[PDB]
Amino acid sequence: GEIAQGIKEIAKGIKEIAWGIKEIAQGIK
Amino acid sequence: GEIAQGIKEIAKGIKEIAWGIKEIAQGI
Amino acid sequence: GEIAQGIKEIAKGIKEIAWGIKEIAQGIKG
Amino acid sequence: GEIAQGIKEIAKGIKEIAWGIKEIAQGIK
Amino acid sequence: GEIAQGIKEIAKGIKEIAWGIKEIAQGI
Amino acid sequence: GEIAQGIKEIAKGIKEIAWGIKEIAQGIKG
Fold first, then answer.
1. If you write DSSP's letter for every residue of C1-30 in order, what string do you get?
2. Which of residues 1-29 of D touch C (CB under 8 A)?
């Protein structure tokens, strides 16, 4: 499904955002 | 299903983003 | 439902992100 | 609906995140 | 419906967040 | 669908946010 695909792509991007935010948080410390 | 799984994975990632944002806010 | 629960947990996390971003924005004012 | 309510609350929080990010972006300049 | 409207408003807010993040990245 | 379109536009914006966050993270390395 187009919706199923979109949700999968959002999940992937959110995982990448979570990683980058942790990098920023550690990089500020 | 696949949608239920995707929503669960998004919820998990958003919880992790919320924690990291709090760490940035405290770190600043 | 599992979807209903997931959406509720996303709403909760988004509220927490919104709070932290506001704290950062104010904290950059010093 | 619980889903309808959740989506409304997410939309509200995303609007607030958009505002705060713009504040940070301007505050960095 | 209400869900379709909410998803449209989320899409709009995410576009605005994407622009602001790019401004921060360029500003840094 | 309107929902299908909205989800696609969210996916696109989230990919762009992910890119910008990576740029910030690397840019904080200098």
1. -HHHHHHHHHHHHHHHHHHHHHHHHHHT--
2. 2-3, 6-7, 9-10, 13-14, 16-17, 20-21, 23-24, 27-28
